[PDB]
Design a protein around this nucleic acid. Sequence first.
RNA 1: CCGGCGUCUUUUGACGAACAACUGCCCUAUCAGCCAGCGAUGGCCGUGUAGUGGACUGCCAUGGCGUUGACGGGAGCGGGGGAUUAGGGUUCGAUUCCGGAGAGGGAGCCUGAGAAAUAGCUACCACUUCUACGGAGGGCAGCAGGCGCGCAAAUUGCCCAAUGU
RNA 2: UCUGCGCAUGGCUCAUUACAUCAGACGUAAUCUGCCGCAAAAAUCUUGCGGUCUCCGCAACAUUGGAUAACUUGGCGAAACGC
Lengths: 175, 148, 258, 50
Amino acid sequence: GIVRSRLHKRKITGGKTKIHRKRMKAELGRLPAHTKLGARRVSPVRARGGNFKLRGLRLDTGNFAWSTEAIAQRARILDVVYNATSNELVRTKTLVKNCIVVVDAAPFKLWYAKHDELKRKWMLRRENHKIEKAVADQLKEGRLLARITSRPGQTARADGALLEGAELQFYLKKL
Amino acid sequence: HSVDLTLQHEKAYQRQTAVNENSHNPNKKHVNMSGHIRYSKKIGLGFKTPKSAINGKYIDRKCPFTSDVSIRGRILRGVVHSTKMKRSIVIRRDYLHFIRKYQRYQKRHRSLTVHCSPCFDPKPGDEVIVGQCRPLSKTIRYNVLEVV
Amino acid sequence: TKKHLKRLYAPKDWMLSKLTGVFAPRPRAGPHKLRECMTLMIIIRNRLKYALNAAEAQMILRQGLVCVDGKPRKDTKYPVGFMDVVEIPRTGDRFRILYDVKGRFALVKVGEAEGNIKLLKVENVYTSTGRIPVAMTHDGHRIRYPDPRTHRGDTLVYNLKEKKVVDLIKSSNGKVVMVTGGANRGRIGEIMSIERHPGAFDIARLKDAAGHEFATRASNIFVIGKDMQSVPVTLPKQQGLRINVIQEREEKLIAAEA
Amino acid sequence: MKLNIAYPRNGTVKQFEITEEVLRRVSLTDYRLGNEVDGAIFGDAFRGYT
RNA sequence: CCGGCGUCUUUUGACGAACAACUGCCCUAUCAGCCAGCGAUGGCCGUGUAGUGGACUGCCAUGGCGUUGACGGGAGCGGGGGAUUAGGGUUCGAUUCCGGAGAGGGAGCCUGAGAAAUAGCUACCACUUCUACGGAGGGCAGCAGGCGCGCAAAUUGCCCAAUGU
RNA sequence: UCUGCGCAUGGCUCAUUACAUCAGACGUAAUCUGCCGCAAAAAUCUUGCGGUCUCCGCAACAUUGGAUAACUUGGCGAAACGC
């Protein structure tokens, strides 16, 4: 079927390869999985390793992480703002690695207020800590910008990290 | 921290994926680039690390110094045929084949393509050393360790 | 997946003939590699001669009358490589296979308490889960909890009576050492020096007794003991010294006059 | 056709016949597998069965 | 009370599978320019695969190879090796061993750790066999054997005793 | 007859084929791997009885549940490794 090979392609000399061999099942493309938003649907496929890999369709939730404090919580994926690859993708709100996105942001808020025995732990954690301004404004409103740092098209789980100052400032200005 | 827009022209941004350098600290301030977070990797066959990699800014995922790209079996030498292309050079090896019947040698050259790290930029006629890395393009299998 | 082997493409250290048969046995995968091993059936039939035919080897082994590593085997085909003790309790004999001088499989005969001793070269060390260190060997054995002084390419004395590891022996310095493969097989000598070439094979220079130095790859070093008077295990028929072609021929004639 | 009529939980089964005449006086297009059928359709000697 | 088998998952040696590259290979210029719309060479981000990769999408760059013979055409499965030669060489390799590819011609697919299998499947094409003609099948470049072909090549035999699986 | 394992190996044939294929040397820190070997394994609220609200109290080689072939019965079709 679909194959991944250099033997239907031109050489560096501009010449053409000539065949003598029918295509292997070792070399083997498959059609791309389309992860979007909506109800979760997961269709496995069997692979050559004797194990299954999972085709994410329509994931509307992700496991997101806040940098620097070494934490994470689940939250809901709402929108896709941006992508490097195309504009077309963004409009359909496809989810593929290194798309900037938008999340519910609620659990992070909740967490950070918890960041008598309790009470003095807080005061210690308040000390020697600060947060970027562009972060906190968004985090107040209850929306945030994050990146999806796992490939959802072959695991059917979408995990992401939350943008921090250096990189956040770039993606912001691209909008 | 803050952006350096001298590097950036991309629609994807570029970051170093080995080590987080995007944390905000005042420890990247009042310094050229020395105090800024970097990834560095030794090549242990006698190829001494440059200054540039260690203290630098540059973001490349196809050189062994700032990436997990590794140096393996073969190491060859060759000159510079052309400097053309972005982060890719063209090396020309030349050697001698022998023919038994005529008892006489002949000159035969392999024109090869390589991915030159943005650390180096050797002039035409310079000699280069190149290692064995995993595929990086269709033709490119090599990388530039050092320059003479 | 290969499941057939032809006599010529098989080792002639198994000492098969060109004529008689067409196939040779391809053994089941195990501790040892295809070239360095010798399959059960070959041993029993062509050397020991407790069998005259293939079917007779099945008769003995399937039933069970034969042990290797002190474990009884119901396997018809199994590898037997190097430093393996095989015991047939019916005869009451204990063979220890080794590499004889001149590239031949040695079958050497040992006292009964030596047949509980075994030597395994370490290949890798690594930490596994729970922080539990592991030495993985050249026979595929896993030594749990090895000594903190263990390194790649060292030997571990291994009790087969009950499984554990007593004191090690290193490849460090001059020590009595023997070769595996490379056609310097069974030749014994001190390590004179260990050369390093990083990113490539590390040469070592060995010097056998009565001089005559030579070179073999680090990979082909297998330690025996601390010293030649501290050896834990027996030597094959020749001591690990080779002789010149002329002297071979001379001695062959001298004995043939009897 | 024929019928092979079967009573579950004895395992008794027996071949009975039905004429063409019978069939002609009922639909066959309106009947398909998984449909229950009243006795009368089969021309009776099957009356009050389902 | 003990022994021998059997199985789930995890772990890594072995037996193999799949990629990549250093060096080498017959004749022909009355074959000298070849390569990019639809990927040619490279960069950037993704997608896919067991995995690396223009393998593939999108974006950006304008490169890559050539008289040290590219490109195209003709002849040819490759090697170990055979023949002949005092030496240098000359010529052969369809064929027992090793490696690759194929099963009428093509393509697609399932299952499996491994197959794009063909005495497995699906379709088309060239053939081809049965049928109270409503339908149902066949693939010898496996061993014998038959037809055809050409100057040219064996028995529709016996046996798993041996050698292997 | 269900179940497990093997049938992808051997065997036979050279049509395609010149940066292909192959031979010597080399890498896979870029990956898969049944059978075989040496080994590893402390998540799991279950079962039974009595009362009783779907709730409790006790007891503890754990005492688990539901179908499908051969078969039997009716059969179909010109035939069919067809049903």
